[PDB]
Design a protein around this ligand. Sequence first.
Ligand SMILES: [Cl-]
Ligand SMILES: [Cl-]
Ligand SMILES: [Cl-]
Ligand code: NA
Length: 129
Amino acid sequence: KVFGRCELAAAMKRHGLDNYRGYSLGNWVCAAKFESNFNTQATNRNTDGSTDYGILQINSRWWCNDGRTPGSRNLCNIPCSALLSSDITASVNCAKKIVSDGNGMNAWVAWRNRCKGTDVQAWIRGCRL
Ligand SMILES: [Cl-]
Ligand SMILES: [Cl-]
Ligand SMILES: [Cl-]
Ligand code: NA
C-alpha cells in the first residue's frame, strides 16, 4: 500500500505517534516519506547484509527477524515480513520501541538528514486529524 500524506498522518495519530517521546506527528510523516515514500512494501538491503523493511524501514540488524542477517537481534520480536503489511500497527509498535532506546529519532538516518530541524509541521498541513 502507498499511503497518501494525510492518510498516513491520521493512521499514525490513531496509533499514538503524535508527540510520542516528544516527536510531533510531522516528524513521523516526514521520516516515512523519505524512508519509504509512504510505501508499506518497501525493502532495501544494507551493505552489512541486514535489510530495512516497510513504511519506516526498520532494520533486521536489531529489530526484526528475517533469518538471513547473521549475528543480528530481533528486539521487536517479530518477523520482518510482518512490517510490510498494509496495516501499520506492527511498524508503529516497533518504532515506539526504537525511538525509546537512546538516541530518539536519530536511529532513522533519513529523519536525521532530511527532517530534523526542518519545518516538519508542513507534512500535516491541511490534514484532517
Ligand atoms: Cl496503494
Ligand atoms: Cl508536526
Ligand atoms: Cl493502518
Ligand atoms: Na537472522
